[PDB]
C-alpha cells in the first residue's frame, strides 16, 4: 500500500490543517477498525495540551486572554483560541469560559493553596484538595493526556509528599507527581451526553459506518460483570 500519514506538520500552527481520513485502514491498507469512514470533511486544529509552556525568552507564570471559544470537529469538547504575549494557541476550554476571559498559567507551587478561578492551570501541589480538575498530565512536562473529553472532570482526592492522587471519571485513582500541571474546573461542552442523534444519517455524518449484520451469540463476557475497584496506579 501507499499510506503516507497526514500527521506530518512539524511546527505548531494556529491555522486549520487539511487532514485525511483513514477509513479504519492500516498503513497496509487492511481494515483494523470497523465502522470508520465517509463523514463530513474536517480540518484539524492543533491543540497545545502542554498547558504551561513559556514562549521564547520568557518564563514564570503568565496571564493569557481568550479570544474565541470555538467548535472543534475533531473532538467532543469545544476549544478556545487563547493569545498571550506574542503567540496564539488553541487550548481546550473549561465549562464557563467566555471571550475576553483571562487565564493564569502558573508553575509556582505555593506554600499555601491557590484559590484558583474556573479556567486557569496550576501544579497539583498548589490546589485545595477536593477541586474539580481536568487536562491532567501523567509526568511533569508530558502534556495533558487525561480527562480531556467534553464535560468530564476529575477530583483531587488527597495529596501526599511529592504526590497527588487524582480520581479519573472512570472512578479509578491515579498517583501523579506533585509538580505536574493540571487545569481546574470541568471541561466545556457540558450536556454533550444529553444529545439526541435523531437519525442514522447524523450518525453517518460523523464518520461512523453501521455495524455488521452478522448475528453474534453472547458468551461469558456479556453478563453484568460487577468487578471490585482496580488498585490505584502510580507514575512515580
Amino acid at each position: 500500500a501507499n499510506f503516507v500519514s497526514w500527521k506530518s506538520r512539524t511546527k505548531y500552527t494556529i491555522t486549520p490543517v487539511k487532514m485525511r481520513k483513514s477509513g479504519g485502514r492500516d498503513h497496509t491498507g487492511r481494515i483494523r477498525v470497523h465502522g470508520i469512514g465517509g463523514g463530513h470533511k474536517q480540518r484539524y486544529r492543533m491543540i497545545d495540551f502542554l498547558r504551561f509552556r513559556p514562549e521564547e525568552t520568557k518564563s514564570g507564570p503568565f496571564e493569557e486572554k481568550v479570544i474565541q471559544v470555538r467548535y472543534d470537529p475533531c473532538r467532543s469538547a469545544d476549544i478556545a483560541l487563547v493569545a498571550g504575549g506574542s503567540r496564539k494557541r488553541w487550548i481546550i476550554a473549561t465549562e464557563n469560559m467566555q471571550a475576553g476571559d483571562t487565564i493564569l498559567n502558573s508553575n509556582h507551587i505555593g506554600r499555601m493553596a491557590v484559590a484558583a478561578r474556573e479556567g486557569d492551570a496550576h501544579p497539583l501541589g498548589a490546589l485545595p484538595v477536593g477541586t474539580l480538575i481536568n487536562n491532567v498530565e501523567s509526568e511533569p512536562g508530558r502534556g495533558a493526556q487525561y480527562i480531556r473529553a467534553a464535560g468530564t472532570c476529575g477530583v483531587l482526592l488527597r495529596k501526599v509528599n511529592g504526590t497527588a492522587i487524582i480520581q479519573l471519571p472512570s472512578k479509578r485513582q491515579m498517583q501523579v507527581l506533585e509538580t505536574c500541571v493540571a487545569t481546574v474546573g470541568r471541561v466545556s461542552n457540558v450536556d454533550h451526553n444529553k444529545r439526541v442523534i435523531g437519525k442514522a444519517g447524523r450518525n453517518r455524518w460523523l464518520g461512523k459506518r453501521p455495524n455488521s449484520g452478522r448475528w453474534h451469540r453472547k458468551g461469558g463476557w456479556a453478563g453484568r460483570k460487577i468487578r471490585p475497584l482496580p488498585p490505584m496506579k502510580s507514575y512515580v
Partner: protein, 76 residues
C-alpha cells in the same frame, strides 16, 4: 508532545557496515562501480558542491551569511 510522526519524518539512513570500524583496511564499496550493488559495502560520499552558479538550482546560504542579519528583531 512533538509534532510530526516518525513515519513521515526523514527516514534514518541504514547503519554503516561494520567494515568501517576496522582501522587497518580500506573498504571495498560500489564506488568503483557506478551503481548500487547489494553484496558490496555502501560508500561514504564527500559533500558535493556545484561549482558554478545556476539560477534554477540556487540554494541560499543559511540565515547568518545573509549580509544584513540583525540580532535585534524587527517586527514588520
Amino acid at each position: 508532545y512533538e509534532w510530526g510522526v516518525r513515519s513521515t519524518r526523514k527516514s534514518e539512513p541504514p547503519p554503516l557496515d561494520r567494515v568501517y570500524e576496522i582501522p587497518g583496511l580500506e573498504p571495498i564499496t560500489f564506488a568503483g562501480k557506478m551503481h548500487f550493488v547489494p553484496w558490496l559495502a555502501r560508500p561514504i560520499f564527500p559533500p558535493w558542491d556545484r561549482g558554478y552558479k545556476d539560477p534554477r538550482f540556487y540554494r541560499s546560504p543559511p540565515l547568518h551569511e545573509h549580509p544584513l542579519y540583525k540580532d535585534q528583531a524587527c517586527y514588520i
